[PDB]
Design an enzyme around this catalytic site. Structure first.
Site, PDB file in Angstrom:
ATOM      1  CG  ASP A  93     -34.790   4.385 -10.191  1.00 29.81           C
ATOM      2  OD1 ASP A  93     -34.629   3.176 -10.474  1.00 29.81           O
ATOM      3  OD2 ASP A  93     -34.571   4.847  -9.050  1.00 29.81           O
ATOM      4  CG  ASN A 114     -30.718   0.287  -3.728  1.00 29.63           C
ATOM      5  OD1 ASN A 114     -31.169   1.124  -4.494  1.00 29.63           O
ATOM      6  ND2 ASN A 114     -31.493  -0.551  -3.054  1.00 29.63           N
TER       7      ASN A 114
END
Length: 189
Positions: A93, A114
Site C-alpha cells: 500500500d 514502516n
C-alpha cells in the site's frame, strides 16, 4: 536469475482486510493464479509459495511477523534463494498515491511505509522493485499510522478486488518484460 515477490502485511485475521495488508491480498491472488499454496519456511520464518509465471520460476512470500520487522524475514529469504535486490519485487500500500492508482518503480522513497523501511534496512539498499498500490492518506499533516490499520470503506471495498487484479497483472508484467514496458501498460490512469 532467481526472483522473489513479497507482499507486506500484518498477521492475524483481524488485520487481513486493512489497507496496510493490500500486499498480502495481492500475493494470495498471485498464488491462486499459479496454483500454489503458501507453506511455512523454516529458515526465514516467512511463508512461501513457488510457481512459474509465463515459464519463469518465482518465489512468492508473505512475512509472518509484525509489519515493523518485515525485513528480518525478507533479508534471509533473499539469501536463501540467492536473489539480488534488483530481482526482489515488493507489493505494498502507498499513502502518497490516490486510492487504486498503481505505480511501479525501483529505488526512491518509502512513502512513510514502516514495512518498506524495514526491508530497505535489511537489504542495505533501496534498489528493489516495488508495486505501489495507492490508498490515499488523511489530509493535512496528520499522522497516517492509524489510517493504514483501518479497513477500507464500503465504497472502496467495491473497487479493491479489481485493484488487486490490476496489481497482480502488474507484478506478472514486471517479471515478463521489466520496469519500463510494465510502467507503460500499468500506469493506466
Amino acid at each position: 536469475e532467481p526472483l522473489l515477490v513479497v507482499g507486506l502485511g500484518n498477521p492475524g485475521a483481524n488485520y487481513a482486510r486493512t489497507r496496510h495488508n493490500l500486499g498480502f491480498v495481492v500475493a494470495d491472488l498471485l498464488a491462486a493464479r499459479l496454483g500454489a499454496k503458501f507453506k511455512a519456511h523454516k529458515r526465514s520464518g516467512a511463508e512461501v509459495a513457488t510457481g512459474r509465471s509465463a515459464g519463469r520460476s518465482l518465489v512468492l512470500a508473505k512475512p509472518r511477523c509484525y509489519m515493523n520487522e518485515s525485513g528480518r524475514q525478507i533479508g534471509p529469504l533473499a539469501k536463501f534463494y540467492s536473489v539480488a535486490p534488483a530481482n526482489i519485487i515488493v507489493i505494498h500500500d502507498d499513502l502518497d498515491l490516490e486510492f487504486g492508482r498503481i505505480r511501479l518503480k525501483i529505488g526512491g522513497g518509502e512513502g512513510g511505509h514502516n514495512g518498506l523501511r524495514s526491508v530497505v534496512a535489511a537489504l542495505g539498499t533501496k534498489d528493489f522493485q516495488r508495486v505501489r498500490i495507492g490508498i490515499g492518506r488523511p489530509p493535512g499533516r496528520k499522522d497516517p499510522a492509524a489510517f493504514v490499520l483501518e479497513n477500507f470503506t464500503p465504497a472502496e471495498r467495491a473497487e479493491v478486488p479489481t485493484i488487486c487484479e490490476q496489481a497482480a497483472d502488474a507484478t506478472e508484467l514486471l517479471i515478463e518484460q521489466g520496469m519500463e514496458p510494465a510502467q507503460n501498460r500499468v500506469h493506466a490512469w
